[PDB]
Ligand binder design. Structure first.
Ligand code: HEM
Length: 394
């Protein structure tokens, strides 16, 4: 006798388990056990992943319900699981989304300058360099302080909540609440700080005093700041880090992108497609009995949408494990999700990675791992897959 198949399969972000292709072929929706002991349906084909994400009866909001089967413990208050809905209900969605594009004057220049400064510091210090802690994550942090309009010097302390805030734990995490409450207090203070006039927090600070938002809560305004900083920094820093591994492990592609940087957007789209950054399937709770492939999912059951299941599905992306810069369907991957909860930061995330890679290839055309790939230490019980350090030479 064996136990019910457990998720997640592996914390390694440099290879897809061959179990994924076997599930997808044999049982593209199948029962699994999560770290909490709950049962869930793991969905691993492109067709069924899309079906689930495009049907809101598979609800994000309802995953926060008391007594539901859980992927992991909440690290935020339950109402905050519905953060985007709350933003939309407050009339703030258009303005929030506008503030977090890469489009503001000087933003791309700021990203390039920041990337180049970080790289110059690494070059001065000499190999080996840690491209996570000393490149990708500081670039993400700097970007999000700029996008939010908050002081650069405040970035590190906000950042240091993230190794706990984005845990994927069986149980509630006391430190997550300590840091959440502190970070909310910080953002509340930002909203009252007259120096903060630019970026997302500058905009929210004005809207907060406008009559059309007089009944929007102070708590929601502060929550937007904490949630968008955290989601954006963890997602961009982690994606860029693991994308850099994928790139470095493909010297021929590294060389091609170096030689023809106009190909970097197409390269980043493929790096998004093959990314293993999300450590768990995206969770949804069924609000009705719904047929998904061969399974009738019952009301109240948990469904996990495995992004690499979809993105490595050969029925949608032939030769799925290969980076091919001339695919006919390049942006149709699920790296940013799909449907109601599609990532509002997608354009910014693309730009962060494109500029980071452009800068790195120009400054370090010979970039290579400085340790055997198996020596990377993969963070466990976390909502992202990332190496603790990424040692490189050039
Ligand atoms: C390459 C970088 C990024 C990746 C791969 C990524 C991926 C995703 C995914 C897969 C989802 C959907 C989650 C779901 O449906 O359960 C999502 C949602 C979200 N992302 Fe991103 N993201 C990235 C960057 C960003 C940035 C830069 C921000 C903000 C500045 C951001 C903010 C959000 C927020 C707030 C949501 C929740 C939307 C909702 O609940 O409707 N993300 N992201």
């Amino acid at each position: 006798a064996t136990v019910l198949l457990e998720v997640p399969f592996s914390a390694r972000g440099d290879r897809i388990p061959d179990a994924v292709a076997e599930l997808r072929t044999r049982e593209p929706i199948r029962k699994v056990r999560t770290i909490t002991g709950a049962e869930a349906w793991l969905v691993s084909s492109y067709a069924l992943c899309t079906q689930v994400l495009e049907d809101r009866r598979f609800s994000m909001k309802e995953t926060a319900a008391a007594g539901a089967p859980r992927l992991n413990a909440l690290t935020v208050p339950p109402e905050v699981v519905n953060n985007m809905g709350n933003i939309a209900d407050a009339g703030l969605r258009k303005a929030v989304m506008k503030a977090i594009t890469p489009k503001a004057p000087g933003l791309e220049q700021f990203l390039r300058d920041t990337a180049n400064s970080l790289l110059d510091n690494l070059i001065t210090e000499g190999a080996p360099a840690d491209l996570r802690n000393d490149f990708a994550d500081p670039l993400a942090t700097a970007l999000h302080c700029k996008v939010l309009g908050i002081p650069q010097e405040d970035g590190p302390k906000l950042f240091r909540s993230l190794s706990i805030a984005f845990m994927s734990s069986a149980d509630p995490i006391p430190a997550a609440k300590i840091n959440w409450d502190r970070d909310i207090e910080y953002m509340a203070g930002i909203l009252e700080n007259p120096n903060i006039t630019t970026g997302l927090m500058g905009e929210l600070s004005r809207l907060r005093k406008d009559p059309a938002y007089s009944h929007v809560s102070d708590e929601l305004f502060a929550t937007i700041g904490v949630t968008f900083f955290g989601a954006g920094v963890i997602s961009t820093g982690s994606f860029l880090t693991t994308a850099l591994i994928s790139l470095i492990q493909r010297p021929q592609l590294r060389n091609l992108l170096h030689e023809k940087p106009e190909l970097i957007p197409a390269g980043v789209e493929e790096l998004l497609r093959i990314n293993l950054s999300f450590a768990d399937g995206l969770p949804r709770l069924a609000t009705a009995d719904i047929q998904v492939g061969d399974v009738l999912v019952r009301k109240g059951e948990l469904v996990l949408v495995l992004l690499e299941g979809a993105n490595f599905d050969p029925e949608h992306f032939p030769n799925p494990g290969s980076i091919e810069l001339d695919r006919p369907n390049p942006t149709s991957h699920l790296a940013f999700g799909r449907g109601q909860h599609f990532c509002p930061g997608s354009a910014l995330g693309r730009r962060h990675a494109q500029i980071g890679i452009e800068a790195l290839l120009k400054k370090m055309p010979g970039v290579d791992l400085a340790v055997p790939i198996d020596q990377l230490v993969w963070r466990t019980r976390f909502q992202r897959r990332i190496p603790e350090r990424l040692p490189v030479l050039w």
